[PDB]
Amino acid sequence: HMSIFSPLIKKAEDLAFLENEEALASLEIIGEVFKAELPGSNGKIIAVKKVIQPPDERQIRSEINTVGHIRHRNLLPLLAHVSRPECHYLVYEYMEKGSLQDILTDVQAGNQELMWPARHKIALGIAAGLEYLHMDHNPRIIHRDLKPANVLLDDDMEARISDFGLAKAMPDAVTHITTSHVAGTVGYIAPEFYQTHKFTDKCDIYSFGVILGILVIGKLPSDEFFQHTDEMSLIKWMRNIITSENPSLAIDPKLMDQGFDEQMLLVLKIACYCTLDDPKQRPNSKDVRTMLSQI
Ligand SMILES: Nc1ncnc2c1ncn2[C@@H]1O[C@H](COP(=O)(O)OP(=O)(O)NP(=O)(O)O)[C@@H](O)[C@H]1O
Ligand SMILES: [Mg+2]
């Protein structure tokens, strides 16, 4: 029925509202991800992600149990998993800071700012989480869906990677590519995936490299600016500017000429290495974290 992975949920009946349909209809939709108040706790807020059972469905439960035991400073812990005949519910803590996607989008609109030290802290957090998943957890965990929407910020402004591990939660490759086009996140899919249809650690490295590039450029891969550029993609445009006469032009003008230019150019080079067309040319998560910390 349901597996409890965190002491924050005292009783299982506290999640009974998840099996009430008309109670779910009233919940706020923050993502599908609902937002509710934990009944057992004294005002703790939880985010409940709803995934559809695959038509395959037996391995996702073992994968969820594996995810429920993973704990890292830069990984979003899974509090509980509720299993219904129609769908699965993954319970996380609600992070009022939001995701990196929301923060960067609001930074574009001028309703928010994000300094370079904070971005470097976020990048180091994502590197630590990716390295723990790739090279430290006893079974190697592949994210398969790394993007700024699956990286949240806690009250320490630390990165926390989410929505990882579930191999069976993913659709087929064609459906994944089409729905990532509609969602505007195809820029994080490595080139090799169009020929291999298989998720590897190097695909997560490519996604991380696109995120690293975003953190300096200040623009998303879905930006129409790249559709009005010669390279027609964020990665190729960045790759050309890094070796151009003036690489500093790739820096977000909000972060420019504030004493962090060389550091941002270094992480741009790191992202360039993380986004090479050949996966064997890309570095592993440990090397990425070491290079990010060498600044
Ligand atoms: N633990 C969480 N805490 C607070 N907000 C969250 C949390 N998880 C998700 N959200 C919000 O829900 C949005 C994304 O939810 P989600 O259903 O995962 O869509 P997605 O990431 O774009 N696609 P995918 O994860 O591949 O299915 C984010 O922008 C968050 O604002
Ligand atoms: Mg998500």
Side-chain angles (χ1 to χ4, degrees), residues 1-9 11-12 14-20 22-41 43 45-52 54-55 60-61 63-83 85 87-137 139 141-167 169-197 199-223 225-235 237-256 258-261 263-285 287-295:
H1 45 106
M2 60 190 65
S3 301
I4 311 296
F5 303 108
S6 180
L8 310 179
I9 307 183
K11 300 192 173 195
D14 295 348
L15 298 183
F17 74 97
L18 286 182
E19 275 156 345
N20 194 339
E22 28 276 325
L24 288 161
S26 62
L27 301 182
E28 305 178 7
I29 294 184
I30 65 178
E32 322 179 28
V33 179
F34 314 105
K35 175 182 180 179
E37 191 190 295
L38 238 193
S41 68
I45 318 169
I46 58 177
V48 179
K49 183 181 183 64
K50 169 186 179 181
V51 330
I52 308 303
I60 190 179
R61 210 153 312 199
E63 222 139 42
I64 286 172
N65 198 273
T66 308
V67 170
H69 286 76
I70 297 181
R71 290 300 128 103
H72 193 270
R73 185 186 186 92
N74 303 117
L75 251 34
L76 224 229
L78 177 64
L79 312 180
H81 159 248
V82 179
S83 181
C87 66
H88 305 264
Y89 296 102
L90 289 316
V91 185
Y92 310 100
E93 318 110 276
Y94 172 77
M95 314 308 264
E96 63 178 48
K97 235 87 177 186
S99 62
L100 188 63
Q101 168 82 14
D102 302 326
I103 298 183
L104 293 176
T105 286
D106 281 357
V107 166
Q108 282 183 331
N111 302 321
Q112 198 173 344
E113 294 278 291
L114 194 57
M115 301 288 92
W116 173 245
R119 301 168 187 255
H120 187 206
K121 184 178 185 178
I122 297 170
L124 287 172
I126 303 180
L130 260 190
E131 183 191 38
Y132 179 78
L133 290 175
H134 277 4
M135 247 137 276
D136 290 335
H137 198 239
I141 302 301
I142 299 303
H143 193 305
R144 309 176 171 81
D145 211 325
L146 187 58
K147 53 191 180 192
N150 291 337
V151 179
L152 295 130
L153 280 305
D154 53 18
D155 301 302
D156 307 282
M157 292 293 293
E158 279 279 0
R160 289 185 164 275
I161 315 180
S162 172
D163 293 355
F164 60 94
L166 288 342
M170 307 252 57
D172 49 304
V174 176
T175 301
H176 183 51
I177 293 167
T178 50
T179 194
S180 304
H181 259 111
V182 180
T185 54
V186 265
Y188 311 91
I189 300 180
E192 351 133 39
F193 191 78
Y194 289 87
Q195 309 117 26
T196 66
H197 276 5
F199 293 98
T200 68
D201 52 334
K202 264 48 191 294
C203 294
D204 294 316
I205 294 297
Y206 181 90
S207 304
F208 189 22
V210 182
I211 297 179
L212 250 31
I214 294 169
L215 284 182
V216 169
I217 298 167
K219 310 186 184 63
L220 302 183
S222 53
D223 228 80
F225 168 83
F226 299 102
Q227 291 308 118
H228 292 95
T229 210
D230 188 16
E231 294 80 358
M232 287 300 201
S233 75
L234 184 151
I235 295 309
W237 177 83
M238 172 194 64
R239 192 146 52 184
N240 283 351
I241 286 205
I242 289 173
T243 53
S244 69
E245 298 89 357
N246 194 9
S248 303
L249 265 22
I251 303 178
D252 188 0
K254 299 177 183 298
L255 307 159
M256 226 158 54
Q258 297 191 21
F260 301 115
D261 281 10
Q263 312 184 16
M264 292 184 280
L265 291 176
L266 290 180
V267 333
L268 274 182
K269 297 180 183 177
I270 299 179
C272 217
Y273 309 145
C274 293
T275 58
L276 297 180
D277 294 337
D278 197 299
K280 305 183 178 183
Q281 296 174 344
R282 310 188 188 113
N284 55 33
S285 53
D287 296 335
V288 175
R289 184 188 182 182
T290 313
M291 292 186 300
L292 286 172
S293 60
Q294 280 176 357
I295 312 177

